[PDB]
Amino acid sequence: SHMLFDFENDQVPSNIHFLNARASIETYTGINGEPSKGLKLAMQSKQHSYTGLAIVPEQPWDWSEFTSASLYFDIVSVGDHSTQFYLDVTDQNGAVFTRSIDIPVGKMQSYYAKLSGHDLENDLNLASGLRSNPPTWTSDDRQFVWMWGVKNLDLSGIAKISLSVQSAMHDKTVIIDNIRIQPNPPQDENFLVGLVDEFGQNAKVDYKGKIHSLEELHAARDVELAELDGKPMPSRSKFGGWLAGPKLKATGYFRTEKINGKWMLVDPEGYPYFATGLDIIRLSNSSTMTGYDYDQATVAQRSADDVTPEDSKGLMAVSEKSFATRHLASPTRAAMFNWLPDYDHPLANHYNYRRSAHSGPLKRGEAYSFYSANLERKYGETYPGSYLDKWREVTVDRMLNWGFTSLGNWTDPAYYDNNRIPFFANGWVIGDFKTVSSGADFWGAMPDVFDPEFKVRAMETARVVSEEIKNSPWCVGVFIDNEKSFGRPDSDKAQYGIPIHTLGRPSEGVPTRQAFSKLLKAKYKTIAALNNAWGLKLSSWAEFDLGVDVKALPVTDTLRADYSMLLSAYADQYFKVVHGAVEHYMPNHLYLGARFPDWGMPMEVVKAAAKYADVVSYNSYKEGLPKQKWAFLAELDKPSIIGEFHIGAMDHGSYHPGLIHAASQADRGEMYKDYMQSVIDNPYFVGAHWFQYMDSPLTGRAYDGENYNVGFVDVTDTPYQEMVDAAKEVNAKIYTERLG
Q: Any alpha helices (H) in 192-283, and if so which ranges?
A: 214-227
Rounded to 5 degrees, φ, ψ at 244 are -70, -5
Tell me, residue by residue from 57 to 76, as one string, x for binding to ligand 47N by CB under 6 A and - for no binding. Answer: --------------------
Rounded to 5 degrees, φ, ψ at 710 are -115, 15
349 is in an annotated binding site: yes
Residue in 18, 191, 339, 621 binding ligand 47N, rule: CB under 6 A: 621
Residue in 191, 323, 442, 630 binding ligand 47N, rule: CB under 6 A: 442
Interface with ligand 47N, residue 50, by CB under 6 A: no
Min separation Cβ 620 and ligand 47N, Å: 9
Min separation Cβ 487 and ligand 47N, Å: 13
Closer to ligand 47N by Cβ: residue 148 or 207 = 148
Min separation Cβ 609 and ligand 47N, Å: 18
Interface with ligand 47N, residue 597, by CB under 6 A: yes
**37 is in the binding site of which of ligand 47N, Ca ion, none (Cβ under 5 to 8 A by kind)?**
Ca ion
Interface with ligand 47N, residue 491, by CB under 6 A: no
Q: How many CB atoms lie within 10 A of CB 543?
A: 13
Calculate helix-pair angle for 665-681, 721-731, nearest 10 degrees.
20
| Interatomic CA distance for residues 733 and 720, integer angstroms | 21
| Three-class DSSP labels, 92-142 | CCCCEEEEEEEECECCCEEEEEECCCHHHCCCCCCCCCCCCCCCCCCCCCE
**177 is in the binding site of which of Ca ion, ligand 47N, none (Cβ under 5 to 8 A by kind)?**
Ca ion
599 is in an annotated binding site: yes
Residue in 2, 65, 80, 148 binding ligand 47N, rule: CB under 6 A: 148
Torsion angle of the four alpha carbons 120, 143, 280, 627, in this order, in degrees rounded to the nearest 10: -110
534 is in an annotated binding site: no
Tell me, residue by residue from 140 to 179, as one string, x for binding to Ca ion by CB under 5 A and - for no binding. Answer: -------------------------------------x--
**621 is in the binding site of which of ligand 47N, Ca ion, none (Cβ under 5 to 8 A by kind)?**
ligand 47N
Cα–Cα distances (Å) from 448 to 306, 432, 516, in that order, read 19, 10, 12
381 is in an annotated binding site: yes
**148 is in the binding site of which of Ca ion, ligand 47N, none (Cβ under 5 to 8 A by kind)?**
ligand 47N
Min separation Cβ 74 and Ca ion, Å: 8
Asked if 592 contacts 582 with a C-beta cutoff of 8 angstroms, the reply is no
Asked if 60 contacts 159 with a C-beta cutoff of 8 angstroms, the reply is yes
Closer to Ca ion by Cβ: residue 37 or 99 = 37
**50 is in the binding site of which of Ca ion, ligand 47N, none (Cβ under 5 to 8 A by kind)?**
none
Closer to Ca ion by Cβ: residue 31 or 244 = 31
Rounded to 5 degrees, φ, ψ at 191 are -65, -30
Q: Is 692 helix (H, G, I), strand (E, B) or coil?
A: coil
Asked if 502 contacts 566 with a C-beta cutoff of 8 angstroms, the reply is yes
Q: Residue 658: which of 646, 675, 643, 667 has the closest Cα?
A: 646
Asked if 293 contacts 351 with a C-beta cutoff of 8 angstroms, the reply is no
Q: Residue 726: which of 692, 679, 685, 677 has the closest Cα?
A: 677
Interface with ligand 47N, residue 489, by CB under 6 A: no
Rounded to 5 degrees, φ, ψ at 231 are -90, 130
Closer to Ca ion by Cβ: residue 36 or 98 = 36
Closer to ligand 47N by Cβ: residue 487 or 597 = 597
Interface with ligand 47N, residue 599, by CB under 6 A: yes
Closer to Ca ion by Cβ: residue 32 or 59 = 32
Asked if 30 contacts 150 with a C-beta cutoff of 8 angstroms, the reply is no
Interface with ligand 47N, residue 311, by CB under 6 A: no
Q: Which stretch binds Ca ion (CB under 5 A): 2-10, 141-149, 316-324, 448-456?
A: 2-10
Contacts of 586 (CB under 8 A, 6+ apart): 462, 465, 466, 469, 471, 478
**442 is in the binding site of which of ligand 47N, Ca ion, none (Cβ under 5 to 8 A by kind)?**
ligand 47N
Running DSSP on this structure, what letter comes out for residue 79? S
622 is in an annotated binding site: no
Tell me, residue by residue from 18 to 47, as one string, x for binding to Ca ion by CB under 5 A and - for no binding. Answer: ------------------xx----------
Interface with Ca ion, residue 224, by CB under 5 A: no
Instruction: Return the H-helix or E-strand segment holding 498.
Output: helix 497-503
Asked if 729 contacts 276 with a C-beta cutoff of 8 angstroms, the reply is no
Q: Which residue has the closest beta carbon to Ca ion?
A: 36
Residue list for the binding site for beta-D-galactose: 488, 599
**Residue ranges at the known binding site:** 6, 8, 36-37, 177, 346, 349, 376, 381, 488, 599
| Residues at the site binding ligand 47N, with contacts judged by CB under 6 A | 148, 442, 483, 597, 599, 621, 659
| Chain positions contacting Ca ion, by CB under 5 A | 6-7, 36-37, 177
